[PDB]
Design a binder for this molecule. Structure first.
Ligand SMILES: COC(=O)[C@@H]1c2cc3c(c(O)c2[C@@H](O[C@H]2C[C@H](O)[C@@H](O)[C@H](C)O2)C[C@]1(C)O)C(=O)c1c(O)cc2c(c1C3=O)O[C@H]1C[C@H](N(C)C)[C@H](O)[C@]2(C)O1
Ligand code: NI
Length: 257
């Protein structure tokens, strides 16, 4: 529906995020859920974490190892929505498989508020957009996200040292309302790179399973952040990438054809 799709982009532009129910059908959920699990048991995961505990375990660049995940990253419907909201043609940068759970030593902790934007190592990071797809029910207590509507319109935070930092540092920012967005399996959220957002801890004995896909402007180019683990991109060849190099080909596939 054209008119409906436009109401959606209005919401995205106003708020810097939007919630889309049922972006995947039931079977598609089961398909992608089963594959997420498999990757989390077989592949190597990365602990995003601290002495407080595990923020999450995740599988980096998961679309490279797995055709299945590549299909989800490039799912026709998610892609079409992504391009419409973004306003221009896009490419996939990365897809990650995400896990919040409670282990015996290692309790699950929240995802602190943050600002994804200049932690993306590409020229157009400022206007990037991220799709987050629930593969299981994610009510509040299981660690759904919270977004600050409007926050994508604020000036960026002081370019200090950690490219994700600066959430809740701008004048009047702490007085803005916040929206907590529980999701049903197969639901997704889109959010703008500059939108401030956070997530709860998983305080339930059932794991929180989701994918997060970062889409980027089709003409984007490499822009090191300085943080080595953000800058070092697998499946790009032997030597590292020089600044200003274009991100293209199957490695960073176009969304539309
Ligand atoms: C240098 O900081 C660290 O060693 C930790 C850390 C790490 C991250 C981040 C961190 O905040 C931290 C650090 O942030 C601290 C900040 C404070 O000290 C406190 O809120 C708590 C102790 O967590 C912890 C640690 C050991 O320093 C991020 O915030 C982060 C992020 O916001 C976004 C990403 C981040 C991060 C972080 O990796 O990494 C990748 C993967 C992500 N995926 C899994 C959704 C994202 O796409 C993205 C862009 O890419
Ligand atoms: Ni984020």
């Amino acid at each position: 529906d054209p008119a409906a799709l436009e109401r959606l982009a209005a919401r995205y532009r106003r708020d810097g995020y939007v919630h889309v129910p049922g972006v995947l059908d039931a079977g598609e959920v089961a398909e992608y859920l089963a594959e997420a699990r498999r990757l989390l048991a077989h592949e190597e995961s990365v602990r995003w974490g601290s002495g407080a505990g595990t923020v999450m375990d995740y599988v980096a660049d998961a679309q490279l190892g797995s055709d299945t995940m590549r299909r989800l990253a490039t799912h026709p419907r998610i892609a079409a929505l992504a391009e419409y909201l973004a306003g221009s043609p896009l490419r996939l940068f990365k897809l990650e498989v995400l896990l919040k759970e409670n282990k015996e030593k290692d309790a699950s902790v929240p995802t602190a508020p943050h600002h994804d934007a200049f932690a993306f190592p590409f020229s157009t990071a400022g206007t990037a957009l991220t799709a987050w797809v629930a593969l299981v029910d994610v009510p509040v207590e299981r660690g759904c996200m919270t977004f600050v509507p409007g926050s994508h319109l604020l000036p960026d935070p002081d370019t200090g040292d950690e490219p994700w930092a600066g959430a809740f540092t701008r004048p009047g920012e702490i007085w803005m309302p916040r929206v907590t967005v529980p999701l049903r399996a197969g639901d997704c959220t889109f959010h703008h790179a500059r939108t401030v957002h956070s997530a709860g801890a998983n305080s339930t004995d059932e794991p929180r399973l989701s994918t997060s896909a970062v889409y980027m402007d089709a003409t984007a180019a490499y822009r090191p952040t300085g943080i080595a683990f953000l800058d070092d991109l697998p499946g790009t060849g032997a030597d590292p990438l020089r600044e200003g190099a274009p991100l293209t080909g199957d490695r960073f596939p176009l969304l539309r054809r």
